[PDB]
Design a protein around this nucleic acid. Structure first.
Lengths: 331, 445, 479, 27, 60, 173, 256
RNA sequence: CACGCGGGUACGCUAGCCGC
RNA sequence: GGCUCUGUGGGUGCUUGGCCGCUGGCCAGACCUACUUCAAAGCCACCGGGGGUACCUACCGGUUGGGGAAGCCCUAGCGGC
């Protein structure tokens, strides 16, 4: 432990900002003595041998709240000469030696990404995201954060880069695959609302490659359909939904999930006279499904969950509502 | 309004932490004897570096049978050395495993005068026989050469190009001749137009490609431009020069190791005067080599000494010697610029270190800060008398000490004769010619 | 303008941390020397500027007391009022030791203020850690005791017995006695050199190297028994104070005194000298005390008067001084300000300790706390005075809370950087200056009617004829 | 008052609250 | 003081805090402790008497 | 001159990035051997760049039964594609340090811009991977879930049983 | 050794630690955590755990909300008791005595023991308020929490009336009611201290039936043993003993 | 070259005109 | 009721007040920093014995370069011995 000699540099670096704040009338001298003592205690806690990511986050939160307090006080005392750049630089320094000391803590990596995104640092955010993905490649949350922020920026090629490396790594759970199909169809909806893409064959290709993965269950394909069924206002949405249903019917013929997609298929983009027409079609499918030879307890639990989802909406007729209740109660 | 200063021991340790907090006040009232305490630390630093000055590191293998008369490193790799002895056997050494040689062959009949590595992996060797090419790194070991060259007179030295597969061999017919491997057979013979004396050494400039320097036993240095194949300029010095070399960071500076016991650092654009004159030896200088950082020099001399130099010094930074080392013929750095290698006449290749008191490896911060602090403190207070005498004291062998005392007596006598002839002759009404200007006899094109 | 604060900051830092005027870069004629000296001037300027900017990270605050009303004055403040108004961890340090039967006591703190040693006149020498309240040692010794003094640590101390000095370990086990030092009446330990300098009653001053154990230079002060002795903490020269009324400055490299400041008509009774080496206050037998600028060697102000011949005087880490006369000590604040070029006299003392019949033998400042220890005939009494004490110490030089490992490492580093006794002069920063005679001789060996009558008057007495005198005779004949 | 409540909360979090601790003591 | 390292010992070759050369190998302390002399002054008085006796033998 | 180095262990394979590389002439020197001993002077040399753990003991078993036979696995190719800068060796190469010579040849054949140095041939990368194997518990402990001892124990048992076919003709208990 | 006696009194009267081993021991003295863990604990960890305890206590009883502002404050993480003046220390002593009277009823619960552990580990109540802390733990003198408080108490910081506890500090066993009652009949100071503690609580209406039954039982048995001591048979001595018994009792019974 | 606070064209957002 | 241990007060020499900047004051203190003509006479000043002496120091005698108190004289001067 050379921690005193190690923290001497960070205190001597933070000193001239305190000299500027003392030569302005923004912080008084007793308050600056308090800032000196608090930063000194924080540095000698941070550079200690036995340290913790919560200790690094407490120091980050204190420095960031000091920047916010000085911003409020500077706007109140009407000064424009004092800048926040030194505080952002030292907060980046705290975070860089934080991710040096504890690279295996995703809470601290995500706090670093939240800070770098919040003070408008996109290129630095991309570099931090690359380092975090290299250290935690099995983390679907980090991969979806990278891909969704690249899609939110609009660099769809970079979003596909992050997502295809993520689906190359995370193949135990379906989560990142579902989020990639969600992002690709959101790109398809953006390409539609801007008015290949005319076919929209990429989620069908995602399904065809996902057919051979170690998570490939009927529940996983039902999760694929439950992702796909949102935002039906598209062009090839019926093509995608019909391909999912014929894949599940050709592969898992008598599963309750396949009977559930047989129930809930024809209600794609409905909200309105086309609503109860397709509801009567789906209820015919549902009654045939309930009488048919399938695990009725599993199919009934699926249908009462979907019927709670149905009952969550207003603006319907009471006869339809009470016949949903009557068909619910005997399950 | 009473208030006194209260010190908790929280100012030394906060409770719950093992960090001993060290509060520092830099006011000069608290720290007396600044210059005196720093002088004492500088004196301790000199005595510490004289105690831990232990420069000999090892010896490559069993060595050779007769003396090592040529050796050459691989300038692309970092641990490939080769050395050719006096009974005409060459050996390729690997510096990571110094226990035994990697590849040896009974190359020639006579001594191996020059030797070099190609840029691919192969090595070349001169003799009076003629030059040969071997593949020392092959999955079967092959003793036989894969190319040989006898036409072109008796060759003396080699030098390989930096990038391409070109190399120049200095012959004894007064010409150098330049081959390109894989599409040239006899090479192109470049010479000064009416030149007879042998060209001893040859050296490609590694920074500026296609500029070749050479020394010759006409006590002369000659240049060569490879782009327009002709010689360029020729200057005659006073004594014969044993070896030319170029600076690997400054393209225009060269150094000649010469029989005047001296190293002359020249500028290749203006051969009027020497840029520097390193004078520290006792017998003739056999080999000179710049450091790959371009700021230091090794010279192996014809007496039993290696002398380490800074580039602007003009006097020895270090001298290395050993009772087992018989003469010194070829000294060269490693590409670390930390260790030097010495091919002797005892048949030994020895591995010394430059910066004799500076140990290698990874240092902790408070270790390398102490070493850098000592070096900066010696840079400041190195000229004071106690510090000066302890940092200049080095144990020389008795023959070298007696002969440098004789050399000081003879040089003082010659200076007194010249000063008396100046004070009592007609040369009194002239400006004193500087010694760097006196280093060159004539320059011609 | 807005840069006026910048120029004021640079003037203040060049005053404080600059340690010299500045290198004149315009007079340099060489080009490489000009750019390297410009580089050095830039580095030294940013050095002083960064030290001044990093003087904000100082933790503690200097203590004080200031009178509120116009009738209230600072010297009328009672110690019970100070103890009521002050914090409890520093109100604990105001104690009083009641040791009556073993002579007037003599207090000396260690130079971090951890342990104090107090020695009675009839023999009772004790060594205690006065904050933690434990005593490291107590021993009785029989014979009289002239002066007790800590060495570099609180490990070794040195006691001046009836004939010799003795140095003792931490437990009080006597390590050895020094037989060359006979009848030692005063002692002073140079801290940075490891020399222990002893004035005998005969007037002989011996410097003994404590680390290696050989006396460096026995100087014989040719005139009289010495009355007092102090030690400049900046030069490590010894201000001893004689009985004819001069103080003399001594150094181990000269048998004559370096200067002799002429002082009071009677003997000087006590001396004290600032830790920055600026000023020296001396109290004489003639009832006056007076302060001197030491860097110029002149008297700063008129002589103050003390109402009795002051037995001791000791000045603090800040500007305070305690002058202890008769049976009660008085503390003065503003005797010598560093910033003022011409000093002014102080009208009233800062604060006065009471006279209740205990004659003051020796006052000492605890080096880092805001207290004052008075050793008197009834024992030891520590009073608290707020303005004193350096608030911000440096942990590398001397530490009030030094652990065992830090004490061991600091003792070894001080041993390695002990200074040779030939490095003592009036100006302690001379190491590296020019030998002007040797430089003139080096440049010589490189480049190679009113006085000419007393010339012949001096050279007619030899009677060597010496042809330069023949030329001088021909010149005098022509004149 | 001329201070926001969010500014006083940041002042109590960042800078300390020693004066209001002494005020809460002496009641 | 801790046990000195190699380089620290080589720089402080002539250093020890306990036994000087003026202490005479602590012969005073060893004789006082052996023969229960309660006064070091009594040791040095006996020693100066023995020294005067030895110089009388030397002049004889 | 090494740039990165692979290091495969029972919990997974991690590649370190060297900064302040090791002296190759003074490898047999006592000060450099003491630097390779002490973690406070070898962690200045290595900085952990990437880590890839296994998904399951079946993947770890496939990893040993590919790596010991010599052939590299697809997820090792994946993590090298992710961590190494994508080059082809025409004007700039990346020096990787690997423990086995056959794995070196295959990584160089899969990535043409990566020149691999085997620990069986090169003493610098041999000493450097030796130091990482020495301090491998502390270089990974910020993301080492649990320990390495039981992982090495169970993985050695699974590898030996797959090589021997133990359970199909051990039945007497 | 008069100097060693004066220095022993100075070292016993001293309150703040002045060397690192003393700071580490005084920080190591805790109720909940073992010493090997309690050395290496900053004042944010202790404040988090013990503020969870005080949140539970403040949800149990309503009247802890001023101590939420003054004693268990996030600023009271940082206050050093030995750096404030005498009036700040006296007002802090009043606040601590009020909290201990308030928390004495719930002291078998782990929230209240966590709150007392915060007071002990921050404000050093076992050194600066030994009287009120020992009196508020005295009705629970049969519990392991009283055994731990007896373990962490300094010896010379206990008042003179509670110096019967020294063999129970040397051998860590809970003291019996026979020992407390016998020291109450022998010393009037211990009986006066117990009665003063419970009357000072009952004037602030922070009584609880455990404390009331404790004081009633010990004053009953102490007056019993005190009468059996005061009985003498000589007329003037029994007159003076009845007068001394009434002068030692009368304020307590005249208020209660 | 730009970097704080307001009303604007515009927000499950901040890109753009002028001020404080 | 007894032994032991501990604490306080008196005594273990013939009784004249607590403090101070003391011929006067104070015990609740008060005022605070002035005033000044000419630095100083010399000597002594304890280390155990025998021995060495390169370096430092002390004492004694000198050598170069400067410096001029004082003594003596007179052509009077920025003087001379």
């Amino acid at each position: 432990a050379w921690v005193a000699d190690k923290a001497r540099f960070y205190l001597e670096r933070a000193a001239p900002e305190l000299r500027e704040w003392e030569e302005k009338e923004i912080f008084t001298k007793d308050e600056i003595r308090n800032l000196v003592a608090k930063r000194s205690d924080f540095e000698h806690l941070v550079l200690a041998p036995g340290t913790k990511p919560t200790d690094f986050l407490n120091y980050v939160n204190w420095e960031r709240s000091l920047d916010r307090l000085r911003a409020k006080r500077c706007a109140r005392l009407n000064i424009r000469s004092v800048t926040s750049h030194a505080s952002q630089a030292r907060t980046f320094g705290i975070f860089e030696r934080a991710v040096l000391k504890h690279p295996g803590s995703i809470e601290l990596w995500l706090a670093y990404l939240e800070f770098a995104a919040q003070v408008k640092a996109t290129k630095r955010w991309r570099r931090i995201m690359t380092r975090a993905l290299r250290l935690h490649p099995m983390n679907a949350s980090l991969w979806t954060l990278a891909g969704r922020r690249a899609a939110q920026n609009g660099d769809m090629q970079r979003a596909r880069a992050h997502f295809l490396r993520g689906c190359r790594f995370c193949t135990r759970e379906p989560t990142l695959w579902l989020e990639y199909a969600r992002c690709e169809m959101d790109w398809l909806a953006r390409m539609e609302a801007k008015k290949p893409a005319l076919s929209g064959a990429i989620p069908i290709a995602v399904f065809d490659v996902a057919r051979k993965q170690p998570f490939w269950g009927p529940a996983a394909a039902e999760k694929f359909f439950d992702v796909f069924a949102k935002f039906g206002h598209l062009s090839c949405h019926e093509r995608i939904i019909s391909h999912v249903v014929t894949t599940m019917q050709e592969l898992f013929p008598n599963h309750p999930c396949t009977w559930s997609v047989h129930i809930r298929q024809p209600l794609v983009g409905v909200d309105t006279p086309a609503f109860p027409k397709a509801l009567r079609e789906s209820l015919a499918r549902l009654k045939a499904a309930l009488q048919s030879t399938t695990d009725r307890k599993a199919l009934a639990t699926k249908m009462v969950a979907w019927m709670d989802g149905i009952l969550a909406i207003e603006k319907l007729d009471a006869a339809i509502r009470t016949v949903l209740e009557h068909t619910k109660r005997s399950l | 309004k009473i208030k006194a200063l209260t010190r908790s021991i929280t100012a030394q340790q906060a409770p719950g932490s093992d960090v001993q907090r060290a509060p520092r006040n830099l006011a000069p009232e608290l720290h007396p004897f600044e210059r005196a305490r720093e002088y004492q630390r500088a004196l301790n630093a000199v005595k510490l570096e004289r105690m831990f000055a232990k420069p000999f590191l090892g010896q490559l293998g069993n060595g050779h049978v007769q003396g090592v008369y040529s050796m050459c490193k691989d300038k692309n790799s970092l641990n490939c050395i080769a050395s050719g002895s006096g009974d005409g056997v060459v050996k390729v050494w690997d510096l990571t495993t110094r226990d035994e040689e990697t590849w040896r062959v009974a190359a020639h009949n006579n001594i191996v005068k020059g030797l070099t590595f190609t840029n691919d992996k192969k090595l070349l060797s001169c003799a009076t026989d003629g030059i040969k090419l071997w593949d020392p790194y092959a999955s079967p070991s092959n003793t036989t050469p894969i190319a040989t060259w006898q036409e072109g007179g008796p060759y003396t030295s080699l030098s390989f190009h930096r990038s391409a597969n070109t190399f120049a061999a200095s012959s004894g017919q007064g010409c150098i001749r330049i081959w390109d491997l894989e599409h040239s057979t006899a090479g192109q013979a470049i010479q000064w137009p009416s030149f007879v004396d042998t060209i001893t050494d040859v050296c490609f400039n590694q920074v500026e490609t296609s500029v070749i320097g050479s020394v010759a036993t006409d006590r002369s240095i000659i240049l060569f431009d490879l782009r327009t194949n002709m010689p360029v300029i020729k200057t005659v010095l006073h004594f014969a020069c044993n070896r030319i070399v170029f600076n690997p960071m400054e393209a225009m500076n060269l150094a000649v190791a010469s029989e005047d016991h001296n190293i002359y650092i020249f500028d290749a654009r203006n051969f009027d005067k020497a840029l520097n004159i390193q004078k520290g030896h006792v017998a003739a200088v056999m080999d000179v080599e710049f450091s790959p950082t371009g700021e230091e020099l090794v010279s192996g001399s014809y007496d039993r000494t290696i002398r380490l130099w800074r580039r602007d010094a003009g006097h020895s930074r270090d001298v290395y010697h050993t009772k087992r080392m018989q003469r010194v013929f070829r000294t060269m750095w490693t590409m670390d610029s930390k260790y030097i290698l010495t091919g002797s006449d005892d048949g030994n290749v020895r591995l010394w270190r430059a910066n004799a008191s500076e140990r290698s490896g990874v240092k902790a911060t408070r270790q390398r800060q102490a070493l850098e602090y000592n070096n900066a403190l010696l840079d400041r207070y190195g000229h004071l008398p106690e510090i000066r005498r302890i940092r200049r004291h080095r144990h020389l062998p008795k023959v070298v000490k007696k002969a440098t005392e004789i050399k000081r007596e003879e040089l003082a006598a010659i200076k007194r004769r010249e000063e008396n002839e100046r004070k009592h002759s007609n040369k009194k009404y002239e400006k004193r010619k500087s010694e760097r200007e006196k280093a060159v006899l004539v320059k011609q094109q | 303008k807005a840069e006026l604060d910048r120029i004021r900051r640079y003037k203040q830092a060049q005053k404080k941390y600059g340690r010299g005027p500045r290198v004149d870069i315009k007079s340099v004629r060489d080009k490489k020397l000009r750019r390297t000296l410009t580089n050095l001037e830039n580095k030294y300027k940013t050095a002083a500027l960064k030290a001044k900017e990093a003087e904000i990270l100082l933790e503690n605050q200097t203590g004080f007391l200031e009178p509120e009303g116009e009738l209230e004055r600072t010297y009328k403040v009672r110690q019970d009022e100070i103890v009521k108004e002050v914090a409890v961890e520093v109100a604990q340090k105001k104690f009083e030791l009641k040791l009556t039967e073993l002579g007037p006591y003599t207090c000396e703190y260690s130079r971090n203020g951890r342990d104090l040693i107090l020695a009675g006149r009839k023999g009772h020498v004790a060594t205690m850690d006065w904050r933690e309240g434990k005593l490291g040692c107590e021993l009785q010794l029989g014979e009289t005791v002239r002066d007790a003094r800590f060495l570099h640590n609180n490990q070794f101390f040195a006691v001046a017995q009836k004939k010799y000095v003795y140095i003792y370990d931490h437990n009080g086990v006597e390590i050895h006695c020094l037989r060359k030092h006979v009848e030692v009446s005063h002692m002073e330990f140079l801290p940075y050199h490891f020399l222990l300098a002893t004035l005998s009653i005969s007037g002989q001053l011996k410097y003994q190297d404590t680390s290696t154990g050989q006396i460096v230079a026995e100087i014989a002060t040719k005139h009289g028994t010495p009355v007092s002795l102090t030690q400049n903490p900046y030069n490590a020269i010894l201000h001893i104070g004689q009985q004819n009324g001069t103080v003399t400055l001594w150094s181990p490299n000269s048998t004559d005194p370096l200067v002799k400041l002429l002082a009071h008509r009677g003997p000087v009774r006590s001396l004290a000298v600032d830790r920055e080496g600026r000023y020296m206050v001396s109290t004489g037998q003639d009832n006056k005390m007076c302060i001197w600028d030491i860097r110029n060697f002149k008297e700063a102000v008129n002589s103050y008067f003390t109402r009795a011949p002051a037995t001791s005087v000791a000045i603090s880490d800040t500007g305070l001084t305690a002058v202890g006369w008769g049976t009660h000590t008085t503390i003065w604040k503003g005797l010598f300000n560093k910033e003022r070029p011409v000093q002014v006299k102080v009208d009233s003392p800062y604060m006065t300790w009471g006279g209740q019949g205990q004659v003051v033998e020796r006052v000492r400042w605890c080096p880092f706390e805001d207290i004052l220890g008075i050793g008197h005939n009834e024992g030891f009494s520590s009073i608290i005075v707020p303005g004193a004490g350096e608030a911000n110490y440096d942990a590398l030089e001397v530490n009030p809370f030094e652990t065992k490992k830090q004490r061991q490492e600091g003792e070894v580093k001080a041993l390695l950087n002990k200074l040779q006794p030939e490095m003592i002069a009036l100006d302690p920063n001379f190491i590296g200056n020019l030998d002007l005679r040797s430089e003139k001789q080096r440049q010589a060996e490189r480049d190679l009617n009113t006085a000419l009558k007393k010339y012949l008057r001096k050279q007619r007495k030899k009677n060597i004829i010496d042809e330069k005198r023949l030329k001088a005779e021909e010149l005098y004949r022509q004149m | 008052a001329e201070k926001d409540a969010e500014e006083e909360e940041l002042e109590k979090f960042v800078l300390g609250a020693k004066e209001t601790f002494r005020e809460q003591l002496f009641r | 003081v801790r046990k000195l390292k190699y380089h620290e010992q080589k720089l402080l070759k002539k250093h020890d805090f306990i036994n000087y050369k003026s202490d005479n190998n602590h012969r005073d302390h060893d004789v006082i402790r052996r023969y229960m002399i309660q006064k070091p002054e009594d040791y040095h008085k006996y020693n100066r008497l023995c020294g005067s006796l030895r110089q009388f033998a030397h002049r004889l | 001159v090494v740039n990165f180095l692979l290091f495969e262990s029972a919990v997974g394979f991690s590649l370190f990035e060297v900064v302040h590389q090791a002296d190759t002439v003074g490898l047999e020197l006592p000060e450099v051997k003491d630097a390779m001993k002490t973690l406070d002077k070898f962690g200045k040399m290595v900085k952990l760049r990437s880590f890839n753990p296994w998904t399951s003991a079946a993947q770890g078993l496939e990893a040993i039964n590919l790596i010991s036979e010599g052939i590299m696995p697809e997820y090792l190719k994946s993590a090298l594609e992710m961590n190494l800068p994508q080059t082809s060796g025409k004007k700039s190469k990346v020096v990787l340090g690997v423990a086995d010579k056959k794995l070196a040849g295959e990584i160089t054949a899969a990535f043409p811009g990566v020149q691999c140095e085997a620990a069986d041939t090169s003493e610098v990368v041999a000493a450097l991977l030796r130091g990482i194997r020495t301090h491998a518990n502390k270089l990974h402990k910020s993301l080492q879930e649990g320990d390495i001892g039981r992982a090495q124990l169970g993985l050695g048992h699974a590898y030996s049983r797959a090589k021997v076919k133990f359970s199909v003709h051990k039945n007497d208990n | 050794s008069s100097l060693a006696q004066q220095l022993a009194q100075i070292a016993a009267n001293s309150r703040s630690s002045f060397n690192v081993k003393a700071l580490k021991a005084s920080h190591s003295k805790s109720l909940i955590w073992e010493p090997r863990v309690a050395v290496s604990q900053t004042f944010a960890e202790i404040y988090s755990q013990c503020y969870e305890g005080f949140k539970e206590l403040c949800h149990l009883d309503s009247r802890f909300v001023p101590f939420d502002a003054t004693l268990f404050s996030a600023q009271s993480q940082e206050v050093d008791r030995t750096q404030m003046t005498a009036e700040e220390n006296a007002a802090l002593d009043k606040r601590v005595d009020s909290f201990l009277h308030l928390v004495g009823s719930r002291l078998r619960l782990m929230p209240a023991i966590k709150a007392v552990e915060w007071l002990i580990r921050r404000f050093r109540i076992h050194e600066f308020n030994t009287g009120t802390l020992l009196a508020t733990f005295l009705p629970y003198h049969t519990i392991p929490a009283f055994v731990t408080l007896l373990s962490i108490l300094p010896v010379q910081r206990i008042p003179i009336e509670y110096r019967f506890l020294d063999p129970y500090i040397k051998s860590l066993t809970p003291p019996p009611r026979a020992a407390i009652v016998q020291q109450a009949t022998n010393r009037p100071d211990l009986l006066s201290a117990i009665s003063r503690y419970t009357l000072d609580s009952c004037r602030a209406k922070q009584e609880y039936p455990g404390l009331i039954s404790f004081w009633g039982g010990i004053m009953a048995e102490a007056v019993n043993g005190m009468i059996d001591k005061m009985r003498s048979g000589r007329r003037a001595i029994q007159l003076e003993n009845d007068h001394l018994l009434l002068q030692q009792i009368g304020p307590v019974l005249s208020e209660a």
